[PDB]
Design a protein around this ligand. Structure first.
Ligand SMILES: [Mg+2]
Ligand SMILES: [Mg+2]
Ligand SMILES: [Mg+2]
Ligand SMILES: [Mg+2]
Ligand SMILES: [Mg+2]
Ligand SMILES: [Mg+2]
Ligand SMILES: [Mg+2]
Ligand SMILES: [Mg+2]
Ligand SMILES: [Mg+2]
Ligand SMILES: [Mg+2]
Ligand SMILES: [Mg+2]
Ligand SMILES: [Mg+2]
Ligand SMILES: [Mg+2]
Ligand SMILES: [Mg+2]
Ligand SMILES: [Mg+2]
Ligand SMILES: [Mg+2]
Ligand SMILES: [Mg+2]
Ligand SMILES: [Mg+2]
Ligand SMILES: [Mg+2]
Ligand SMILES: [Mg+2]
Ligand SMILES: [Mg+2]
Ligand SMILES: [Mg+2]
Ligand SMILES: [Mg+2]
Ligand SMILES: [Mg+2]
Ligand SMILES: [Mg+2]
Ligand SMILES: [Mg+2]
Ligand SMILES: [Mg+2]
Ligand SMILES: [Mg+2]
Ligand SMILES: [Mg+2]
Ligand SMILES: [Mg+2]
Ligand SMILES: [Mg+2]
Ligand SMILES: [Mg+2]
Ligand SMILES: [Mg+2]
Ligand SMILES: [Mg+2]
Ligand SMILES: [Mg+2]
Ligand SMILES: [Mg+2]
Ligand SMILES: [Mg+2]
Ligand SMILES: [Mg+2]
Ligand SMILES: [Mg+2]
Ligand SMILES: [Mg+2]
Ligand SMILES: [Mg+2]
Ligand SMILES: [Mg+2]
Ligand SMILES: [Mg+2]
Ligand SMILES: [Mg+2]
Ligand SMILES: [Mg+2]
Ligand SMILES: [Mg+2]
Ligand SMILES: [Mg+2]
Ligand SMILES: [Mg+2]
Ligand SMILES: [Mg+2]
Lengths: 51, 64, 52, 77, 76
RNA sequence: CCAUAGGUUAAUGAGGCGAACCGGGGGAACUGAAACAUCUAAGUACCCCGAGGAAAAGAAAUCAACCGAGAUUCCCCCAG
RNA sequence: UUUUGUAUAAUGGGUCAGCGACUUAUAUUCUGUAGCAAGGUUAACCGAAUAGGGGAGCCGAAGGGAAACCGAGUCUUAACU
RNA sequence: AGGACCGAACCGACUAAUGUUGAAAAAUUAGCGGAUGACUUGUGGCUGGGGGUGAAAGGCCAAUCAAACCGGGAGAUAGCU
RNA sequence: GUUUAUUAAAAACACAGCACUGUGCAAACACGAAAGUGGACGUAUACGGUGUGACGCCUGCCCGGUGCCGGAAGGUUAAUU
RNA sequence: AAUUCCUUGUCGGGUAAGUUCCGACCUGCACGAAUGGCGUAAUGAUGGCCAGGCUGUCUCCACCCGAGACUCAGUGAAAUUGAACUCGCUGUGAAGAUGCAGUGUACCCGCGGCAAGACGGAAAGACCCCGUGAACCUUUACUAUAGCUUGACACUGAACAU
RNA sequence: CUUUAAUGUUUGAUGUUCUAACGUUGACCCGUAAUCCGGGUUGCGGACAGUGUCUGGUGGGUAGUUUGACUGGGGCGGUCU
RNA sequence: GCUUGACUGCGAGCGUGACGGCGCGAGCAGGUGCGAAAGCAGGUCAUAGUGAUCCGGUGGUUCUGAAUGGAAGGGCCAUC
């Protein structure tokens, strides 16, 4: 139970750190986001087919 | 709702026996002639996914 | 870059070819070299062709 | 309104495309024309608002037969 | 300005030092020009990369009229 | 000129209202894509028409695969 | 509270009382725990109905390869010590 | 005769003082301009929001205008506080 | 004369006049998916648009660029076949 | 010059003294002919400059008449406010101290006044920057599109001549 | 095969003349107590015009947006492998 | 002087990168070249001369071929 006082050890920030995307309500990047670069599953080429 | 797999990643990674993922090497599409044969030969075989990117791959592939 | 890439096609008819570059201002004559052909597993003469 | 009295064709909506596939809403309207059809049985001219496709079916179906359907349709020619 | 350019460092230098046991094919030193020369059981790459041609201990020695520095492998 | 349009009566019927659900006619943008045009949002919001207690759909010019199944609708799988 | 750093002459609050912010659903992975175990478990639905039925399916015990294929091997290659 | 002159009503709003928690969410006091005209006013009517209207300032369109107000999409979004 | 109602009344806007240009009347143009309406129950001595802005003396040179107007032989060129 | 940067250009007039004004000069940074040029009577709550009259505008303020301010009675707000037992100086210090250090001064508390400070009050700064913010507007930015325009086909036929 | 002279054919290119589609915001009659509309008569125009689909050109008329970062603030300059 | 090793399949073991990746490599197999041979040759004294993925193009390929036989298309190899 985060954000329930100093003694709990998870108060006033809820374990989210300080003013990042993870600290915003509904914040955070999608799966595979690499900071702006095209992710590895897009740097690498497709191969093969499904039989 | 059911989690949706990232279809772009599902077409490039196959799970292996010990839980790894294999992918084909890059840099072998259309500027390969100027690359030495030894370089091209090493890119031909399949490769293992590095440890740093394992978490990202698993996130994109929750059902495989 | 003004040197243009060319392909060397095997004379054995396998359809295997190598690729390289050649200077077009000089050496107009076609390039002939003895190179290994993986299909016949022998070194044969490769003839210059056009990349397309 | 822009309704064919024979075939019932009415305006329909679609997209203007482009070389960039951009889609903008548009309308397709029938090729309607007011024509005076000669009905032999009454020896009279009756004016109908018909499409170009409707004109073709009038020759094939006969002037009397289409009007019989129109009276069944209650279109009030 | 018209400056402020450099290339990534290529990490040259000695990888295995004197008396170390190495496997055949292990590169001992990567260099620019023949700072070291290949001796017994040591090969020289196309970029003057010295590699071990046999298992054994790395030994540095100075021989010859030019007072040059040579690397050899004593394969026991 | 017959006719026809038109006109006058007489019979029936319809008008409007009402929550959601239903069918059809139209139909966004914000947003997401860490921008933004294709795309997404979404045939959603909204507008319009019509009907019922349900509506709609429905009795193969359907699927299967060389074996067969036998209208439509709904549920769980198939399957992210 | 925010900061490298605040008695700071940086932000917030006149005071009290009440209210006021990490939840829910589904899926997935990991840990703990319980059951069964090379097996485990059912969903819809049926059902006097939290039982029972329903194993339709799902996961696991075999993988390699783009695939056909082969299989404790397999792929690569003409072939691999 | 006159978009003539001086000057009340009427209409305008140039200067200054006061007022600035106002007597008044734009006014008062003393002066000022027009004052038979492109004047002013009453009562009705018409033009509706990417639209109106504008002797044109991005002015005005119910104390709100470089895109009114109300409801809906909507708990828009907010890498910011 | 008009203007920023509510910090700007001006040298700004308008203005008569002037010039260019469009417009032959089912006029151009404008408002309207359209019908229609305004223009106008008017007809080039008319109407719309643009710039200039009483009056006086005047308004010179450049058609290369960009527009507009005229030409249509040739070059190029869509749907269609 | 409603244009001139250098610049208060130079000369003349006006003044005791004139970076403004007026007249000329031309060296027009960077005027110019209907995005009009130059003049122009009249007009102007038009801008600048000068003179006469006139005056507390001023030298330099004085007095007086009223309405407040002050006192009493009645009614009775507001913005603001972490809490205060709320001094000066010098130094220090999220770098300009009522609150720290040192030191000095100061009996407790009102009332009428003045505003130097409390980085006083007002309003999540309008300037600056930032956000892969918003909106309007411009154009030979991009992609479209209404409209306009071209041709083919359809509505749409006959005959003849080349 | 070339050169092709003529020959029918099949498609077009214009030009001329018709009316019967179509147009008539020409006249007249009726619906009709009616400057709408419709019908009738007639004239004029006429396979045009006009409209539909497709298509080329034009199109800030109207939209949706883009218009980089580093940087002894930013812009400008410079830089980006 | 003679030549095409500017070879094909591979690669023990290492280096350097967060990663994508980049670099070095004896030796092995098949075929070569130069040497009488020992041997050397998987480009150039070395370190710059470069661009991921998607999409599309070209050649090869018994990999696939949505009822079946083909084919299209896709895959793989070479390559733009
Ligand atoms: Mg803690
Ligand atoms: Mg944080
Ligand atoms: Mg915080
Ligand atoms: Mg976005
Ligand atoms: Mg009922
Ligand atoms: Mg401190
Ligand atoms: Mg404070
Ligand atoms: Mg406060
Ligand atoms: Mg468990
Ligand atoms: Mg049960
Ligand atoms: Mg089963
Ligand atoms: Mg193996
Ligand atoms: Mg007057
Ligand atoms: Mg007067
Ligand atoms: Mg006057
Ligand atoms: Mg207002
Ligand atoms: Mg708006
Ligand atoms: Mg609203
Ligand atoms: Mg929404
Ligand atoms: Mg919100
Ligand atoms: Mg005036
Ligand atoms: Mg004002
Ligand atoms: Mg006014
Ligand atoms: Mg004023
Ligand atoms: Mg003017
Ligand atoms: Mg010219
Ligand atoms: Mg010209
Ligand atoms: Mg000056
Ligand atoms: Mg002087
Ligand atoms: Mg002068
Ligand atoms: Mg000028
Ligand atoms: Mg001129
Ligand atoms: Mg001019
Ligand atoms: Mg004056
Ligand atoms: Mg005087
Ligand atoms: Mg104090
Ligand atoms: Mg101090
Ligand atoms: Mg002090
Ligand atoms: Mg006091
Ligand atoms: Mg005072
Ligand atoms: Mg004061
Ligand atoms: Mg303050
Ligand atoms: Mg702020
Ligand atoms: Mg601000
Ligand atoms: Mg930025
Ligand atoms: Mg725009
Ligand atoms: Mg948008
Ligand atoms: Mg920047
Ligand atoms: Mg099939």
């Amino acid at each position: 139970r985060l954000g329930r006082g100093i003694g709990s050890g998870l108060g006033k920030t809820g374990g989210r750190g300080h003013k990042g995307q993870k600290s915003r309500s509904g914040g955070g990047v999608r799966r595979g986001f690499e900071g702006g670069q095209m992710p590895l599953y897009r740097r690498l080429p497709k191969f093969g087919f499904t039989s | 709702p059911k989690i949706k797999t990232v279809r772009g990643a599902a077409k490039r990674f196959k799970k292996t026996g010990k839980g790894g993922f294999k992918h084909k090497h890059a840099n072998l599409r259309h500027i390969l002639t100027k690359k030495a044969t030894k370089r091209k030969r090493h890119l031909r075989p399949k490769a293992m996914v590095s440890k740093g990117d394992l978490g990202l791959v698993i996130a994109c592939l929750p059902y495989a | 870059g003004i040197r243009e890439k060319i392909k060397l096609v095997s004379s054995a008819g396998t359809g295997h070819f190598y690729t390289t570059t050649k200077n077009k201002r000089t050496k107009p004559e076609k390039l002939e070299l003895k190179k290994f052909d993986p299909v016949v597993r022998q070194h044969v003469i490769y003839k210059e062709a056009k990349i397309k | 309104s822009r309704v064919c009295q024979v075939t019932g064709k009415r305006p329909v909506t679609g997209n203007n495309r482009s070389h960039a596939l951009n889609a903008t809403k548009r309308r397709f309207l029938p090729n309607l024309h007011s024509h005076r059809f000669w009905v032999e049985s009454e020896k009279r001219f009756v004016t109908l608002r018909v499409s170009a496709k409707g004109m073709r079916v009038i020759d094939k179906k006969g002037i009397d037969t289409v009007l019989a359907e129109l009276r069944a349709r209650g279109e009030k020619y | 300005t018209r400056n402020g350019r450099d290339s990534e460092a290529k990490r040259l230098g000695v990888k295995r030092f004197g008396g170390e046991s190495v496997l055949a094919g292990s590169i001992i030193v990567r260099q620019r020009g023949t700072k070291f020369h290949a001796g017994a059981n040591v090969g020289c790459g196309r970029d003057h990369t010295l590699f071990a041609k046999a298992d054994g201990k790395v030994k540095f020695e100075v021989k010859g009229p030019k007072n040059r520095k040579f690397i050899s492998i004593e394969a026991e």
